[PDB]
């Protein structure tokens, strides 16, 4: 694995303005632990779930952590759309509060969110995997105003095994970087583009780790990051996650932050 090491537990930094702006700054990432209200997100999980018994073929009798699906292409992301209730759930008070822990500032947050429903490919010998991320920075394709950041919360428990996504430390202070096509990469049966080797250092170690649902990981506009594949065994879990983006209340609202996701896709 090219995961060199876990997230650094940001939970401490919380209460220290100063302290929790440096290690952003530094590093461009927070990880922050039950900071979520967690029936909150077992509710988004439950609608994630019912959306894939109605489009999905799942088992309308598995427990979140029973759930597999045969094919994440196979089910209408639109209509998946309809069922995950995303937007109550960034704008509950309890969640607004975390934003504007982070910020420290009034937040606005973006009318798109990405959802992930990736059933494990363990000992798939043809694994389908492009339509994953491959690197590359948020602020390559959101802007012009690059001082979002990015808001990542899994819905049910990852492990080191399903994934997530993984981030390439201390990648986000030497601006946009060169996306490139890549043929191993594909989204809807297009082409995809993602940062080379040649631009991803040595030095900007890869991390990821285990999430709790109720734990956030956010990140910098110019963080480079990539998914991790679910190639989970022991047990064998879905990796069920949304992604959005919030900004100051106060900056530039672009297209991306004004255009739901079925609008723009
Ligand atoms: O979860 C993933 O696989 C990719 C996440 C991502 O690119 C993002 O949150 O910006
Ligand atoms: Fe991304
Ligand atoms: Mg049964
Ligand atoms: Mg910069």
């Given at each position: 694995?090219?995961?060199?090491?876990?997230?650094?537990?940001?939970?401490?930094?919380?209460?220290?303005?100063?302290?929790?702006?440096?290690?952003?700054?530094?590093?461009?990432?927070?990880?922050?632990?039950?900071?979520?209200?967690?029936?909150?997100?077992?509710?988004?999980?439950?609608?994630?779930?019912?959306?894939?018994?109605?489009?999905?073929?799942?088992?309308?009798?598995?427990?979140?952590?029973?759930?597999?699906?045969?094919?994440?292409?196979?089910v209408d992301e639109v209509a998946m759309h309809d069922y995950v209730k995303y937007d109550a759930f960034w704008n509950n008070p309890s969640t607004i509060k975390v934003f504007e822990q982070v910020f420290g500032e009034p937040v606005f947050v973006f009318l798109s969110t990405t959802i992930r429903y990736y059933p494990s490919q363990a000992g798939s010998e043809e694994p389908s995997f492009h339509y994953l991320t491959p690197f590359h920075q948020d602020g390559f394709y959101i802007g012009p105003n690059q001082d979002f950041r990015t808001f990542w919360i899994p819905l049910i428990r990852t492990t080191r095994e399903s994934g997530g996504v993984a981030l390439a430390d201390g990648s986000h202070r030497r601006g946009k970087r060169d996306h490139v096509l890549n043929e191993s990469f594909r989204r809807f049966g297009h082409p995809v583009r993602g940062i080379p080797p040649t631009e991803v250092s040595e030095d900007e170690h890869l991390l990821h780790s285990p999430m709790e649902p109720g734990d956030i990981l956010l990140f910098h506009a110019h963080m480079c990051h990539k998914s991790i594949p679910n190639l989970s065994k022991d047990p064998r879990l879905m990796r069920m996650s949304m992604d959005t983006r919030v900004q100051p209340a106060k900056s530039h609202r672009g297209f991306n932050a004004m255009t739901p996701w079925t609008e723009s896709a």
């Amino acid at each position: 694995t090219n995961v060199t090491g876990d997230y650094t537990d940001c939970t401490p930094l919380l209460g220290d303005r100063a302290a929790l702006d440096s290690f952003y700054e530094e590093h461009g990432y927070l990880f922050l632990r039950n900071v979520l209200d967690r029936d909150l997100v077992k509710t988004v999980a439950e609608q994630m779930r019912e959306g894939l018994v109605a489009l999905g073929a799942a088992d309308p009798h598995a427990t979140l952590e029973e759930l597999t699906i045969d094919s994440f292409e196979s089910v209408d992301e639109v209509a998946m759309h309809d069922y995950v209730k995303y937007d109550a759930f960034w704008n509950n008070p309890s969640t607004i509060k975390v934003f504007e822990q982070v910020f420290g500032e009034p937040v606005f947050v973006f009318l798109s969110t990405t959802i992930r429903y990736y059933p494990s490919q363990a000992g798939s010998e043809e694994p389908s995997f492009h339509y994953l991320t491959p690197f590359h920075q948020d602020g390559f394709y959101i802007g012009p105003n690059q001082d979002f950041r990015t808001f990542w919360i899994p819905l049910i428990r990852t492990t080191r095994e399903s994934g997530g996504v993984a981030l390439a430390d201390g990648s986000h202070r030497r601006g946009k970087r060169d996306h490139v096509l890549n043929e191993s990469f594909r989204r809807f049966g297009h082409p995809v583009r993602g940062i080379p080797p040649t631009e991803v250092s040595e030095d900007e170690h890869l991390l990821h780790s285990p999430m709790e649902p109720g734990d956030i990981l956010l990140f910098h506009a110019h963080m480079c990051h990539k998914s991790i594949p679910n190639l989970s065994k022991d047990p064998r879990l879905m990796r069920m996650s949304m992604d959005t983006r919030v900004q100051p209340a106060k900056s530039h609202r672009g297209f991306n932050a004004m255009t739901p996701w079925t609008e723009s896709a």
